Design a protein around this ligand. Structure first.
Ligand SMILES: NC(=O)Cn1cc(-c2c(Cl)cnc3[nH]ccc23)nn1
Length: 297
């Protein structure tokens, strides 16, 4: 990863956009992939921290431009884009600012029961449109094959935990990957376009109108399992409940909720193996060691 001073952001924008004079600039957010900057109170500028994040910024731009105006909820519109550099597919990107605050589980549980049922209706129609977007014109660089991901990970995990586990602790790991790779329900899906990061902090809310007014962060959007846009809203602790999500699945006419829960249960256990890979990828020591303990159990 890397980092930028304010002046570095401004000069990168001026370079590529010399007619665009900046007046106000704040740090808006800081994710794992990008730093977001609010510029002139109306634009969010994503700047990547690392090569992996700039191709997520490249893909986000490309996905937003291509789904421009198709969805039933406001999404960012691409207004400014940077350039590919050395190791960076995209140096930066500027989007339109979507108003609203995130629809947090506390925010939601404080809404009237009507507005809660509306929120689930709105998310259903959003995911229902999104998933029915024809995806025959995307490139293979946007498709999430799950199997090969499981397999790349699996090899990663064998080299990382080699100097960390050994035999008995591992063979349980091996039994866990092969158990997944065997199970078709994880792989026998109809791919569609998915948000892939569909969680409470990416759903913008209008506390005056008491309705959802925004979906943001398509940096992980891909062609993949549409059950992914539902499991990321379950989690009880950090997300909504199965109570609210189930209302979403029912407005969506999802015809197999038991395998939504099979997938949820599996991504839950798998999260510890993502911590080891990303923990070791970015540098997050605590994410690595938080992945290890969970394994050893
Ligand atoms: N680090 C990040 O959170 C990157 N990011 C920023 C946004 C975003 C944008 Cl693009 C524009 N208007 C918005 N309004 C509120 C958020 C939001 N979504 N993802």
């Amino acid at each position: 990863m890397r980092t930028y001073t304010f002046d570095q952001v401004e000069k990168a924008i001026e370079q590529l956009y010399p007619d665009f004079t900046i007046n106000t600039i704040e740090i808006s957010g800081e994710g794992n992939d990008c730093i977001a900057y609010e510029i002139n109170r109306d634009f969010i500028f994503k700047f990547p921290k690392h090569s992996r994040g700039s191709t997520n910024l490249f893909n986000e731009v490309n996905i937003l431009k291509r789904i421009h105006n198709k969805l039933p909820l406001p999404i960012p519109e691409v207004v400014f884009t940077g350039m590919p550099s050395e190791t960076y597919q995209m140096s930066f990107a500027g989007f339109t600012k979507i108003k609203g605050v995130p629809l947090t589980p506390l925010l939601l549980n404080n809404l009237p029961k009507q507005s809660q049922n509306q929120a689930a209706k709105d998310l259903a129609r959003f995911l229902s449109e999104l998933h029915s977007i024809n995806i025959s014109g995307f490139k293979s660089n946007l498709v999430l094959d799950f199997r090969e991901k499981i397999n790349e990970d699996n090899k990663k995990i064998k080299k990382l935990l080699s100097r960390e586990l050994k035999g008995p602790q591992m063979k349980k790991v091996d039994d866990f990957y092969r158990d997944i790779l065997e199970n078709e329900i994880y792989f026998k899906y109809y791919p569609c376009l998915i948000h892939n990061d569909f969680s409470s902090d990416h759903i913008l809310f209008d506390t005056e109108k008491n309705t959802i007014c925004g979906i943001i962060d398509f940096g992980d959007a891909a062609i993949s399992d549409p059950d992914n846009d539902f499991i990321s809203l379950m989690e009880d602790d950090e997300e909504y409940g199965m109570e609210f999500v189930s209302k979403i699945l029912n407005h969506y006419k999802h015809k197999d909720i038991p395998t939504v829960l099979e997938k949820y249960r599996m991504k839950e256990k798998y999260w510890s193996f993502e911590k080891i890979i990303y923990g070791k990828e970015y540098g997050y020591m605590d994410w690595y060691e938080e992945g290890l303990n969970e394994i050893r159990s």
